[PDB]
Amino acid sequence: SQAPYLSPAVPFSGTIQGGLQDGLQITVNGTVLSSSGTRFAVNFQTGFSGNDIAFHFNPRFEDGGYVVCNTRQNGSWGPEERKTHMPFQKGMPFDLCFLVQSSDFKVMVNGILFVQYFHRVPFHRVDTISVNGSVQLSYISFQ
Numbered sequence: 001s002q003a004p005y006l007s008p009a010v011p012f013s014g015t016i017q018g019g020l021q022d023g024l025q026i027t028v029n030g031t032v033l034s035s036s037g038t039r040f041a042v043n044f045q046t047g048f049s050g051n052d053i054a055f056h057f058n059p060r061f062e063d064g065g066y067v068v069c070n071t072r073q074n075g076s077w078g079p080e081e082r083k084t085h086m087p088f089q090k091g092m093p094f095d096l097c098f099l100v101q102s103s104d105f106k107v108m109v110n111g112i113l114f115v116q117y118f119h120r121v122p123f124h125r126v127d128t129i130s131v132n133g134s135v136q137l138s139y140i141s142f143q
Contacts, residue, residue, distance in 0.1 A: 040133035
């Protein structure tokens with residue numbers, strides 16, 4: 001059972017030991033920084049390059065607050081899935097949980113379902129989690 005990453009520095013890249021598995025939970029506990037920019041991202045990808053991101057979760061404190069989800073494949077982005085809600089507040093730590101399922105990721109914010117994102121590329125091929133942008137991390141954990 002994988003040990004958590006404690007206070008990882010941002011921008012962060014870490015192996016997921018099993019790779020994703022149906023039933024796996026990944027918890028990201030962090031805080032958006034005030035007056036340090038307007039977006040951050042959590043990426044589930046294959047390897048460390050950044051060119052093949054199965055699931056890009058991208059909150060943007062712009063235009064009212066919204067979040068974009070997308071997939072990148074061979075360094076081309078597909079169609080964005082936007083949600084016009086900002087479930088994060090600057091200065092407030094959040095628990096952002098990703099549950100892997102057969103057909104989708106379920107994304108919870110403090111336990112409440114935020115977005116469901118259907119796999120565009122096979123979940124089993126994901127072996128890496130990455131965070132970047134305007135956020136400070138406290139931990140990333142696995143169950």
